[PDB]
């Protein structure tokens with residue numbers, strides 16, 4: 001029994017160390033452990049139905065973050081749906097993903113590590129978690145899968161940009177349709193090649209600012225054409241394709257914002273609540 005500042009707090013469900021827990025009255029979750037204090041300050045700034053809420057903290061000579069409980073993550077939903085999800089659902093999950101991320105961006109914060117397991121869903125409704133690598137606007141930055149990273153980041157971009165999360169939302173959007181990860185580079189060095197092998201290699205003519213990126217000067221890349229959206233995501237509705245393509249364009253200045261994406265005609269039929 002560990003004393004928080006709000007309450008006293010039990011199965012083991014952890015990784016990477018997360019437990020399940022009982023309040024003196026409600027079910028919570030306990031994340032055990034630098035990037036933790038960060039996570040508190042950032043999470044206090046982020047109160048939103050689509051961001052997993054932090055309810056308490058326990059300090060011992062190990063930090064424990066007390067969170068609202070969440071049945072599962074999207075990593076697990078994709079294992080029950082190996083060929084993708086129902087169009088009704090993709091729309092729902094995607095929309096909530098955009099709503100959480102939009103809230104972050106309005107509040108000058110970037111998740112920077114969006115991926116299915118960092119998206120928790122409760123049995124009712126999906127929420128962003130794990131702000132360990134989040135970037136507050138103006139504060140300097142201080143293992144992982146590279147499958148959802150923006151190509152420009154992978155190429156050495158250091159600049160603050162909301163576009164970085166939209167790339168990740170794109171890869172997740174695509175993953176929900178096929179059931180499979182869009183850019184599963186076999187090693188870390190294969191990630192950019194993998195990306196280009198599907199979306200085509202970017203060219204300086206259309207996107208003049210690759211040339212200014214640190215890994216573009218230090219490396220040449222095999223030149224691919226884009227694979228038609230027809231073979232990447234067979235049979236998906238045109239509206240969806242349009243949206244995904246606007247999430248996945250190479251030029252961070254052309255890439256759609258979370259808020260704009262919420263207004264896309266693909267979301268014509270969904271209740272915005």
Ligand SMILES: O=C1Nc2ccccc2/C1=C1/Nc2ccccc2/C1=N\O
Pocket residue numbers: 013014015018028029031052067068069070071072120129130
């Ligand atoms: O309910 C939760 N709220 C969280 C907030 C932050 C991180 C995790 C969780 C979390 C988790 N719930 C789970 C249920 C089964 C297996 C793992 C987790 C888990 N995490 O592994």
